[PDB]
Amino acid sequence: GAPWWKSAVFYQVYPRSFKDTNGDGIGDFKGLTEKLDYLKGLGIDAIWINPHYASPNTDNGYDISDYREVMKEYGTMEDFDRLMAELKKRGMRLMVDVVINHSSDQHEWFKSSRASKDNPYRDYYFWRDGKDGHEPNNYPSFFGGSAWEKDPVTGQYYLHYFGRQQPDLNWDTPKLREELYAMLRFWLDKGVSGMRFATVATYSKTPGFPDLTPEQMKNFAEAYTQGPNLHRYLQEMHEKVFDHYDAVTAGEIFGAPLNQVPLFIDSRRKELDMAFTFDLIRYDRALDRWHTIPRTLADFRQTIDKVDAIAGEYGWNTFFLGNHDNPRAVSHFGDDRPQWREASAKALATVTLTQRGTPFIFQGDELGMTNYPFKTLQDFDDIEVKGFFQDYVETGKATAEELLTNVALTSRNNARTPFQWDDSANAGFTTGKPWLKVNPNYTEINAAREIGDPKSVYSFYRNLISIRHETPALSTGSYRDIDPSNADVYAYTRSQDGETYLVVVNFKAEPRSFTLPDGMHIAETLIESSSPAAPAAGAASLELQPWQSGIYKVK
Ligand SMILES: OC[C@H]1O[C@H](O)[C@H](O)[C@@H](O)[C@@H]1O
Ligand SMILES: [Ca+2]
């Protein structure tokens, strides 16, 4: 049979922005725990939570200062234990985020490492002499400036691919590997069902740290995935940790060329179980990560087809249209204008829930939440944007205005505005002042309004989750794009054990038709959105309303 995770629907919870229960304006574990019935009723099998560890929060949990303690803002270890127990009560599973490319610079390992060149923890991190009067080499940081920071305590520089307060951990050091493996066991021994490995493809660094070529410089995120020992380390982690448990692992394979993805997820390789890739969600992002490039449905569907191709007989993909690092799904891939938001959000739900792979729904997407109307500099506050200011505005490459107009569309804060529970003060997320403002559209878009409405985005998601669960081909079926070149109507089949389903989604705000492949006809209509009526049994074609979606069994 297929592992539970291949037929699961996951929901991602960004705990900081999901539900606050003590009026400090930051979401927490008690808030999440209080909302499990809501997630269970939606039909969710397992939740992935963003990092929940002790953290100075320079990067909202991705800078961890103690891997064996809970972040103070979310609660205590007891609250974490209660979350797990309450999930388990409901037959639901927890996946946690694992951030072991780097720690906080406040982690005690780093506090020791920096003390001297002979410190026992010195090689828990990468320390190098400057060269030619400046940095060890020309590596840039994702979060601005050089990836090398001089520490005058020793006069050497340490490596940080991300923030200056996120020094990279040195996987070449076996005692470091052993500490990380022991840390992973600490959490898995508590009963955690899954682990998502953040930036998993950057763990291996190239011996000697030679300069990037100017080609590599223009795509340094890819260069940082090419360390010669990467798969050696992932295999060791599996041997020493995951072989001993039954937790699912997922890698956030950021930066890596798609053709390398099989090395991470082929089950025979004993590395990771499934891939988060970024080819789709960044399919319209420029190399600088902040400009957008126009794309069409043909580019969208062709990327999916390529990502599907790298999950062979033995590999497996996740599928997602949003996460805490990206704009809102309906804003990004749909049409978020008041007249099309609901219709297009339903369309994208149909896509999400009928893809081959394990779908992850990001918190709020089931309501049709949208991008935020940024109005002030403060609205954009985020370490990555601070870095774009450093790299692009201080250097005179762009004005602040150019940067913010563009980051309005791409800002990670679009995804981090509080979840909109109801139409009370701050959409019911907090009784205090939320850490990020609530989107003003919460008067219209909120869970309490949608749950009771048969025609809401929520109810559609719920109904799609039910259909997928009921229908094996829709989870583990083969996938085939009916016409990769079509830029109007996305259509595809899922097949398993001699049953074939057809998914058809108009991405245009206009009527369009669709002719089924010769020899194929409609047998039954499982569900549709924005349709006035279902096709007649035997139909060789369909008339589509704007943004209409449907799933059909064919014959
Ligand atoms: O840790 C640095 C970054 O790593 C991953 O890309 C995370 O998904 C992102 O939120 C984080 O800032
Ligand atoms: Ca709180």
Entry keywords:
alpha-amylase activity; binds alpha-D-glucopyranose; 3 domains; globular; alpha/beta; Immunoglobulin-like; 26% helix; 5-stranded antiparallel β-sheet
What's the gist of this structure?
By secondary structure, the protein is of the alpha/beta class. It folds into three domains: 1-103 and 174-477, Alpha-Beta Barrel (TIM Barrel), CATH 3.20.20; 104-173, Alpha-Beta Complex (Oligo-1,6-glucosidase, domain 2); 478-555, Golgi alpha-mannosidase II (Immunoglobulin-like, Sandwich). The chain has helices at residues 29-34, 36-42, 77-89, 108-113, 174-188, 214-218, 220-223, 230-240, 261-265, 297-309, 329-333, 341-352, 383-393, 400-410, 447-451, 457-470, 473-476, and strands at residues 10-13, 46-49, 53-54, 66-70, 93-98, 127-128, 148-151, 156-159, 194-197, 248-252, 274-276, 318-320, 358-362, 478-481, 489-496, 499-506, 512-515, 522-529, 541-544, 549-554.
Describe the structure.
With 555 residues, the protein is α/β, with parallel strands linked by helices. 26% of the residues lie in helices and 17% in strands. It has 17 helices and 20 strands. The protein has helices at residues 29-34, 36-42, 77-89, 108-113, 174-188, 214-218, 220-223, 230-240, 261-265, 297-309, 329-333, 341-352, 383-393, 400-410, 447-451, 457-470, 473-476, and strands at 10-13, 46-49, 53-54, 66-70, 93-98, 127-128, 148-151, 156-159, 194-197, 248-252, 274-276, 318-320, 358-362, 478-481, 489-496, 499-506, 512-515, 522-529, 541-544, 549-554. The protein starts with 9 loop residues before the first strand and ends with a strand. Bound molecules: alpha-D-glucopyranose and calcium ion. Alpha-D-glucopyranose binds at residues 59, 62, 99, 162, 198-199, 254, 325. Pfam families: Alpha-amylase, Malt_amylase_C. Belongs to the glycosyl hydrolase 13 family. This is Sucrose isomerase. Ca(2+) binds at residues 20, 22, 24, 26, 28.
